[PDB]
Amino acid sequence: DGEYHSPYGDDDLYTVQPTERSPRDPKAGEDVILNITTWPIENGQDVWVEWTKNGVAQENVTAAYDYNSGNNTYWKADLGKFEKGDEITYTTKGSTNGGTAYESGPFTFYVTDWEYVQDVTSVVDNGDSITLNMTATAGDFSPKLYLSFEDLDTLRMELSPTGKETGHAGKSGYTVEDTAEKVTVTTEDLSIEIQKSPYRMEVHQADGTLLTSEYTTANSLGWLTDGKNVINQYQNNFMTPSDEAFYGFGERYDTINQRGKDVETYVYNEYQDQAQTERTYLAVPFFVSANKYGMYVNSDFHSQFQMASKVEDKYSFVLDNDGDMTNMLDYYVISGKDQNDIVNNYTDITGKTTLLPKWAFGLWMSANEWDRESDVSSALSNAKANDIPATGFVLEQWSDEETYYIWNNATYTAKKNGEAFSYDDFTFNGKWTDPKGMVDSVHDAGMNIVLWQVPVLKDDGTVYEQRDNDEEYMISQGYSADDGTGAPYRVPASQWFGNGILLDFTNKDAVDWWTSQREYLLTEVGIDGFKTNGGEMVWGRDTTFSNGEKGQEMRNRYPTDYVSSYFDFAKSINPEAVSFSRSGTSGAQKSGIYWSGDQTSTFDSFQASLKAGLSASTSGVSYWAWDMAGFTGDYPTAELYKRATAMAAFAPIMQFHSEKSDPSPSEERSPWNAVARTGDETILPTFQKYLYTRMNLLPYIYTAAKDTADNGKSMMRQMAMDYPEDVNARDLDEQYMFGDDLLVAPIVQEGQTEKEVYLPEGEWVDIWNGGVHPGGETISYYADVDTLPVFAKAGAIIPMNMTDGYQLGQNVGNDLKSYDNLTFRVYPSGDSEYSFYDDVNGGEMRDISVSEDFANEKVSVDLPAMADETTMQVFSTEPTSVTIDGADVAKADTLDAFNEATTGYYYDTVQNLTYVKAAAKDAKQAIVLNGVNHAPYEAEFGHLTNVTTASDHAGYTGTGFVAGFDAEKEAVEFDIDAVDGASDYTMEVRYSAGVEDATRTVYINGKKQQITLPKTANWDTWNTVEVPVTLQAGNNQVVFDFEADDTAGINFDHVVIKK
Ligand SMILES: OC[C@H]1O[C@H](OC[C@H]2O[C@H](O[C@@H]3[C@@H](O)[C@@H](O)O[C@H](CO[C@H]4O[C@H](CO)[C@@H](O)[C@H](O)[C@H]4O)[C@H]3O)[C@H](O)[C@@H](O)[C@@H]2O)[C@H](O)[C@@H](O)[C@@H]1O
Ligand SMILES: OC[C@H]1O[C@H](OC[C@H]2O[C@H](O[C@H]3[C@H](O)[C@@H](O)[C@@H](O)O[C@@H]3CO)[C@H](O)[C@@H](O)[C@@H]2O)[C@H](O)[C@@H](O)[C@@H]1O
Ligand SMILES: OC[C@H]1O[C@H](OC[C@H]2O[C@H](O)[C@H](O)[C@@H](O)[C@@H]2O)[C@H](O)[C@@H](O)[C@@H]1O
Ligand SMILES: OC[C@H]1O[C@H](OC[C@H]2O[C@H](O)[C@H](O)[C@@H](O)[C@@H]2O)[C@H](O)[C@@H](O)[C@@H]1O
Ligand SMILES: OC[C@H]1O[C@H](O[C@H]2[C@H](O)[C@@H](O)[C@@H](O)O[C@@H]2CO)[C@H](O)[C@@H](O)[C@@H]1O
Ligand SMILES: [Mg+2]
Ligand SMILES: [Mg+2]
Ligand SMILES: [Mg+2]
Ligand SMILES: [Mg+2]
C-alpha cells in the first residue's frame, strides 16, 4: 500500500534516513544510489526509476532488493556516475503484480565540480572597496573578489563566482600599490600582500609580521558548481605552522585547541556525550588564533573547519550553500590591539553582549523536581536556614505540560483563535493555588524567578482542548514554518518534541502571537524571565521560513531567533528580565545567559564543562553557566561537589540544577541536599565559603560583566587570550583568567591535591593568604578538597563588598541596593588604574588610580568622589603613617576600633594588608601610605627542607615562622621578585634568636654570602637584619641554608625586599 523515497531525509549531518539519495548532492564521477522503501512486504513487487538526463529520457533503472525490516522492503537503485553540468530528474516507483504504481518525486539534482580562482587579471580601486577581477581554473565564470575594511584592522572578503554581485563599502583609510605581479593594500594596522599569478593572499600586520596566508600552491579559493544552475559550496585553504593553536568555534566540549580536528558549525542537541561525539548546542563559525588574528565566516549555513586535519600545514573552511548562485562567500580576517580586542572586533560585526542586571550574577537555584508551591516554599526555607543568599530561581516543572503557558492544574474556559489569557481567566488549583503569591514570596527572599519554555507547540496526538485550539490557529495563520508542500513543519518523529510544530521566529506576527500568550506571566504573575530551552529542532532541506530562507540556512540561526525573540519580549515588559538558554550561533551573545547543557556528575564531565566555557568565551559568549557538579547520573561525590562549587563560584554564572522529575531521595544539587545525600556535613561550610566569596567579589564580577558588554572582554578566559605569545599558555584547560586580574586554577581531577598552576610572567599573589608567586613557571599548589588556588595579578585593584570582618568568605547577604563595606583590594605595582562600575549608585564609573613608589616607601591612591565610605586593603608592610588630603588619619589598634572610626587605618599582620578608611565625599581624595615596602615574603610559605613551621611565639607576620632551622641540610627557599627591575636591594631578615648569636648562609641566584643574626632578648623578641643583595629580572632564587660553618637556632619570620 505504498512507496517512499526522499533524497535528503531530514538532512541530518550525522545520520541518514533509510530512503535517501547517496550522495545527497552528487559531484562529478560519484556513483549515485537511491534508497527506496515499499510496504507491506510482498512477493511480486517491482521497484524502478523513471528519469531524464539533460532532458533526455533514459532507460528505466530497476531497483535491487536490499533488506526487509518491520513492515517494509528496502531497495537500492543505481543511477551510475555523472559529469559536471548533468541535470538529472527522476521519479521512484513501486507496484505489485503490474498494479497501481505508487511514486515519489520528481526530484532534480545538478552534478557539480570545483572551480577555483586562477589569476588576478585587474585591480579596480573604488575608494571604499577594491575589486579583484579574476580568472577561474575551469568553467566560464568571471569571478570578482571584493576587499573592504570593516575597520583599519579588520579585512572583509566577498567573493562573487559569477561576478554579478557587488561587495559592501568599508573604510577609505587604505593605500594601494598595484604592480604587474602583485597588489599590496595597506592601512595603519594591516598590510595585505596579494600575488596575482597565481592569486594568493597574505595578511600581515602593518609592521610586516605575518598573521595568516592562503595555501602556497594557491588555487585555494573555490566554489562547487554545475556551471549553470547551482553553487552548492565554497572553500578556502590556508597555510598554518605546526605550533599554531585555534580557539573558539562556539562552545566546544572536547578540546579548547581545535588543531587536528574537523570542526562542524552545526547546532545539535547531544545528551551527555558532547565531548566524545564532538557535538554542541552552540556553534559559531569564528575562531581566534594565537598567531594574533580571528577568522569569521559570515553565513548561517553549515560549515566545516578542517584545522590541519587533512594536511599538517593546511587549514580550510568548506561552507555550504542552498544552490543560489547570487549568495557571495563573505568572511573576515580580524586583527586588533590584542586577542581580546580581536573578540571585540568580532562583536562589532555580530553584536555586543547585552549587560544583564546584577542579580543574574548571584547564585541561581534550580531543580526539575520542584513542581508545586510547597517545593518552592521549602527551597526558600532551606536556603534561608542554611544562609544561602541566592538571587536566581528557576522553575521547570511549572506548567500544564501541554500549552507551556498555563500553570499546572489551572482550570479555565478554553479560548479559540489563539486569543490570550489574563490572570483573572484562571482558577488556580492543586500544585499551584496562587502563582502570583508564590512569585512574590521568591522576590521577598531577594530572588528572581524564570520559567522554562520551548519554541515548539507540543503535539503528541493526545486530545487537549487548549493545545488543539492553538494548533488550529497557528496552522491557519501560517505561524509555523512550512514543510515545503504547504503543510506545517513538524519536528521529526524520533526527536525531542517529535511531531510538534515549531513557531516560525522569523515571522513577526507569529512571534507577537506566541509571546502574547505569555504576556500575563510577566505583567500580572511578575516573573523575571525565561529559561528558553531547545531550538536545535530545524531539519529538512525544504523546510521554509517566512523570511524565504530554508532549512539549511536556518538550522543554526533558528535557536538565536527564538532566544532573542523571548529575551527582547521579556525585557520590553520587565527591564530586569534575564534569559537562560543553551543553543545558538553568531549573535547569541546579545540575548542573555548560556549554560553548557546536559552533563553527568563526574570529573570527566566537569573537565568538558570547563572546555565549553573557555571556548564559548573566545567566541564572544561571556555570560556562561553550567550545572555545577552535573545535573544527572549518580549523585556527585562530596569531593566533586566541593571542587565544582569552588570553580562555579569563580565562573561567569553560578547555578545548580538537577534532571529528575520525581526522585526519591531528592536529586537537588543544592548544598543542603548534597549534605543529606553524601553524609558529608562539611559540604555546607565549604559551599558557604565560596558563595560568600563570590558575593564579596560581586562588585568586581559585575564590573567585569559591564566590560564584556562595552569592550568585548569575556569574564572567564583561556590563558592564551591574555598571553598569546606564551608557549606554556597555549593548551591550558584547567585554569583561566577571571575578570582582568584573577588567575583561577580549579582542581578538575579526581583525587588530586597537588595542583599545577602555570603563572605567566609578572607577580601573582594568593588572594586568600598573601603568598607571593613570581611568574614565568608552573608552580605546585597544595589544595585540599576545600581549597581553590586564586591569584591576583600585579597592579590589581579589586572592588569588594565586605562585612565588618573584612575577610573573604564572610556573608554580605543578597541585598543588591547597597554595600556593606565597599572595599578595594590593591596589589601595588607601578601605576595602575581601574574603572569601577558602581551599580549601587546609578551606574557611575569611579576611576581609581594607584601609584606604587616603594623605592621611596610610598603608595598613593587617588580616590574619586564616592557615595559610600571606602576601605582600601593595600598589600604592603605596615605604614608609619597614612594621610588623606595631607591630613594624618588615626591608627586603629584593633579591627573593632577601625570599624568604629570615621576615617583611619589598620594593619592586618596575617594578610599583610593595610586597611585605610576614607569617608564618603563629593570630591577627589588623595590617600598616601608612608613608610611602606612591598609585602613580606613569609618564611612559612617558602620551600622547606628538613624544617617545619610554628606559631608559639607572638608577633610574627603571616601565619607563623620557620622554627629552629638549626641543623645541616636544613633550608628555606624563596622565589623573590625585584621590586623595580635588576638592581641592588636591601633584604630585611626578620627572626628571633633567643639563646645566642646565629649565622645562616644565603644564596642569591647561586651567589653565596653568610649573614649574622645577633641574639634577641628572648624568643618573644623579633629583630630585623639588613642584608645587601643583587636581584635580577624575573624570579630570583633566594636560599637560606644552615651549613657546617653556621651556628645556633633561630625562628625565621619573613624577608622584606626594599631599596
Ligand atoms: O600561596 C601560598 C601557599 O598557599 C597555600 O598554603 C598556605 C599554608 O602554607 C603553609 O603550610 C602548608 C603545609 O602545612 C602543607 O600541608 O601544604 C602546603 C605545601 O606543602 C608542601 O610544600 C613544600 C614543597 O613544595 C614544602 O616546603 C612543604 O614542607 C610541604 O608541606 C603548605 O603551604 C602555612 O604553614 C599555612 O599556615 C598556610 O595556610 C598552598 O597550600 C601552598 O601551596 C601555597 O604556596
Ligand atoms: O517539566 C518540564 C520538562 O522537564 C524536562 O525537561 C527539562 C530539561 O530539559 C532539557 O533536557 C532535556 C533534553 O533537551 C532532551 O533532549 C532529553 O535528553 O531530556 C532532557 C531532560 O533532562 C534541559 O537541557 C534540562 O536542563 C532540563 O532539566 C522533561 O524532559 C520535559 O518533558 C518536561 O516537559
Ligand atoms: O485545555 C484543556 C482543559 O484544560 C483545563 O482543565 C485541565 C484539565 O485537564 C484535563 O483535560 C483533565 O481531564 C481535567 O480533569 C483537568 O481539569 C480547562 O479547565 C478545560 O476547560 C480544558 O478543556
Ligand atoms: O641555638 C639555640 C637553640 O636552638 C634550638 O632551639 C630553637 C627553639 O628554642 C626554643 O625552644 C623556642 O621556644 C623555639 O621557638 C625555638 O625554635 C635548639 O634546639 C636548642 O638546643 C638551642 O639552645
Ligand atoms: O507518508 C510518508 C511516510 O511513508 C513511510 O511510512 C510508511 C511506513 O514505512 C509503512 O510501514 C506504513 O506504516 O505506512 C507508512 C505511511 O503512513 C516512510 O517510512 C516514512 O518515513 C514517511 O514519513
Ligand atoms: Mg576595534
Ligand atoms: Mg516535586
Ligand atoms: Mg549588597
Ligand atoms: Mg554600606
Ligand SMILES: [Mg+2]
Ligand atoms: Mg611569618
